[PDB]
Ligand binder design. Structure first.
Ligand SMILES: CCCC(=O)O[C@@H]1[C@@H](C)[C@@]2(O)[C@@H](C=C(CO)C[C@]3(O)C(=O)C(C)=C[C@@H]23)[C@@H]2C(C)(C)[C@]12OC(=O)CCC
Ligand SMILES: CCCCCCC(=O)OC[C@H](COP(=O)(O)OCC[N+](C)(C)C)OC(=O)CCCCCC
Ligand SMILES: CCCCCCC(=O)OC[C@H](COP(=O)(O)OCC[N+](C)(C)C)OC(=O)CCCCCC
Ligand SMILES: [Zn+2]
Ligand SMILES: [Zn+2]
Length: 52
């Protein structure tokens, strides 16, 4: 099953589970999967493994 990512607003430092770097910024720093909670950059979304 593919992930179901949504734009998310993080309130504590959160790293991208795909590429390892911090999700930088004040708002809308990345995407969170509705089902497994994975956090990724907007631009990392297309590159993550599709097994949720
Ligand atoms: C500017 C507001 C002051 C502040 O503390 O903002 C920090 C701010 C430094 C932050 O911790 C941020 C969360 C994320 C996600 O990875 C982005 C980062 O922004 C970022 O790029 C850096 C360097 C720290 C990160 C959350 C938010 C913007 C809510 C924040 O709040 C807290 O951590 C709560 C205290 C434990
Ligand atoms: C439903 C989305 C959350 C809406 C409320 C957001 C919120 O303010 O925080 C409650 C916490 C988790 O927030 P965070 O996930 O950014 O981490 C905790 C941050 N801090 C320690 C400073 C509180 O938020 C959650 O409950 C997590 C659920 C995530 C939705 C995905 C199905
Ligand atoms: C969803 C798209 C993400 C774009 C980032 C939007 C955002 O909230 O941040 C503004 C970002 C980048 O700025 P930064 O998040 O790098 O500055 C934060 C400074 N500090 C790390 C010390 C707290 O710079 C902008 O002007 C926008
Ligand atoms: Zn998922
Ligand atoms: Zn990333």
């Amino acid at each position: 099953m593919p992930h179901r990512f949504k734009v998310y607003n993080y309130m504590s430092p959160t790293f991208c589970d795909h590429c390892g770097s911090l999700l930088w910024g004040l708002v809308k720093q990345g995407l969170k999967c509705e089902d497994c909670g994975m956090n990724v950059h907007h631009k990392c979304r297309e590159k993550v493994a599709n097994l949720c």
